[PDB]
């Protein structure tokens, strides 16, 4: 009778869901209200659901020339581009010039033709105030004969995964910090170009040298103690402030926040990652 405690719950649920009684009467009115209204949802409803879930737009292009046969209105809320720019053009007019060969190979029907699937990433022009700006679009679709007749029917979506830290920039002016990686001995094995603006050294002037070679002697013990902390703290972040030896402004107060990168499998120390910020 766990079978009809769920059936009584089912029938009460159905009663609540119908816009209008004992079990047979509520299920007899269910029948009538069912005939009030073959797939579960309609293609229109499913289109709107998909567009509620995906930041994407549908486009049909000719396989031979890339000519835009159709594009949905969704392209403007997605790509900041009116349908004016897509209709009457080709897909190659919309993509980054370095993606043209890849798109042409995706549009060829020499091995996979009618019904076959396509999956590829490219970069498309967005609406620009100035000089085009490109955004990464994930495209999935299928090849279909179009009543010189093969076409790609595809959807292009943004934000399929999390966005990357493209810049690390938290200002609009000269950078305040730079990221570095170090081995267990403290040797610079990675540094991004912002170091030129923060400490005046080119990346190659830092790589290969130890971080302590750039620290004030009076601070060095402190820097070394903190580093020996983070290799023992296995992942946790520790911050230290010392006098970094710049190339033109003498001794700069610098806050380095460090943590060890643990190998997700072997738990070995791949390197130490530091954010070096001018205090």
């Amino acid at each position: 009778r766990r079978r009809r405690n769920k059936m009584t719950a089912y029938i009460t649920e159905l009663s609540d869901m119908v816009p209008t009684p004992d079990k047979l009467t509520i299920l007899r009115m269910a029948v009538s209200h069912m005939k009030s209204l073959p797939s579960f949802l309609t293609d229109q409803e499913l289109k709107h659901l998909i567009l509620e879930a995906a930041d994407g737009f549908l486009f049909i292009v000719s396989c031979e020339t890339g000519r835009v046969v159709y594009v949905s209105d969704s392209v403007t809320p997605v790509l900041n581009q009116p349908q004016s720019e897509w209709f009457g053009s080709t897909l190659y007019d919309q993509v980054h010039p370095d993606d043209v060969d890849k798109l042409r190979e995706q549009l060829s029907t020499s091995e996979n033709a009618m019904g076959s699937r396509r999956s590829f990433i490219c970069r498309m022009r967005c609406g620009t105030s100035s000089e085009p700006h490109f955004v990464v679009v994930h495209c999935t679709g299928y090849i279909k004969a179009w009543p010189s007749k093969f076409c790609l029917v595809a959807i292009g979506r943004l934000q399929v995964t999390s966005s990357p830290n493209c810049t690390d920039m938290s200002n609009i002016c000269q950078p305040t910090e730079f990221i570095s990686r170090h081995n267990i001995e403290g040797i610079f094995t990675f540094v991004d170009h912002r170091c030129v603006a923060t400490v005046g050294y080119q990346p190659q002037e830092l790589l290969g040298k130890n971080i302590v070679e750039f620290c004030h002697p009076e601070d060095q013990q402190l820097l070394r103690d903190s580093f020996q902390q983070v290799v023992k703290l296995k992942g946790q972040v520790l911050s230290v402030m010392f006098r970094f030896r710049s190339k033109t402004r003498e001794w700069l107060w610098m806050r380095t926040s460090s943590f060890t990168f643990q190998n997700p499998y072997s738990d070995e120390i791949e390197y130490i990652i530091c954010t070096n910020t001018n205090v």
Binding site: M7, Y10, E13, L14, M17, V18, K23, L27, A30, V31, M34, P38, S39, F40, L41, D43, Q44, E45, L46, K47, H48, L49, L51, E52, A53, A54, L58, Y70, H96, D98, R117, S119, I121, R123, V136, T140, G141, Y142, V153, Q159, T161, S162, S163, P164, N165, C166, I179, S180, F188, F190, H193, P203, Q204, L207, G208, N263, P264, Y265, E268, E270
Partner: protein, 288 residues
């Protein structure tokens, strides 16, 4: 004895209700009263939801997607699943709509799901899930209790009008490949790396892959690898891979644990080498 007469009346009219469902001619006869009820409940709820939406080529959209659409309630109830879910999990929508998602996902992914139910924009969701699937290389050959765990990359939006609507896609099991041990040290890499990044495939063998990613992406990559190691498959976001003489290229990666156990990575190039004059790592500097 009029009780069972009324009882036959009741289930005659529930079979009537079954014939009122939006499924093909004959599909009625493979159902039980409980599932008939459940499907009717969920049809009405999805109709109520679609009625709240303010609104020929419509059928291309589901055809254009690879994965399936799923609508989950705030209480984790699978409000809707498209038909093509049968192509990804074997379980059709006939047996899934109405049931709870927590009855079909791996027990160590339920916390992640619930955190998702409560760099990114406030209401966009990206998460990996392990769902029950009865599919093999021969079709739906597994009965539900021997079902396997299929990893789905699910991305979508929290829409309150209160739902979480997702596109859930499968990660294909393995053009440009790389093979690593579980510590992600290169055991093999496609010969096309030379024209893409500058590296001879022999020069990468034994090297740790983490040395070849931009530091700005490490965290992200790290998380992905964890998923790869705990669920069997993973897919990263866009990340920067360092070229040989300098600079980096934008790329994305799908990864699968195989077999003792190895990792296979399929890489998709997003851009060409940027900032080739700039050296970023110690290795680029020596090879420069």
């Amino acid at each position: 004895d009029a009780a069972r007469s009324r009882r036959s009346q009741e289930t005659e009219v529930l079979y009537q209700l079954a014939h009122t469902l939006p499924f093909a001619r004959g599909v009625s006869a493979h159902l039980d009263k409980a599932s008939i009820m459940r499907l009717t409940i969920s049809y009405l709820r999805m109709h109520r939801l679609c009625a709240a939406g303010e609104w020929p080529l419509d059928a291309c959209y589901l055809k254009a997607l690879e994965g399936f659409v799923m609508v989950l309630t705030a209480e984790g109830d699978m409000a809707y699943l498209s038909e093509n879910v049968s192509k990804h999990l074997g379980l059709s929508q006939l047996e899934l709509i109405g049931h709870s998602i927590f009855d079909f996902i791996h027990p160590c992914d339920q916390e992640e799901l619930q955190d998702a139910l409560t760099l990114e924009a406030p209401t966009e969701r990206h998460f990996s899930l392990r769902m029950k699937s009865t599919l093999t290389s021969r079709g739906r050959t597994l009965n539900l209790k021997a079902a396997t765990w299929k990893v789905l990359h699910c991305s979508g939006h929290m829409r309150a009008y209160q739902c979480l609507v997702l596109i859930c896609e499968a990660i294909p099991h393995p053009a440009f490949l790389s093979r690593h041990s579980l510590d992600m040290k290169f055991t093999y890499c496609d010969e096309r790396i030379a024209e893409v990044a500058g590296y001879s495939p022999d020069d990468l063998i034994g090297c740790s892959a983490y040395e070849y990613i931009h530091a700005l992406d490490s965290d992200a990559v790290s998380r992905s690898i964890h998923t790869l190691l705990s669920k069997g498959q993973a897919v990263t976001g866009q990340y920067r891979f360092l070229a040989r003489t300098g600079g980096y290229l934008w790329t994305q990666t799908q990864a699968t644990v195989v077999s003792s156990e190895s990792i296979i990575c399929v890489h998709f190039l997003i851009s060409r080498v940027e900032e080739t004059g700039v050296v970023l790592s110690l290795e680029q500097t020596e090879q420069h």
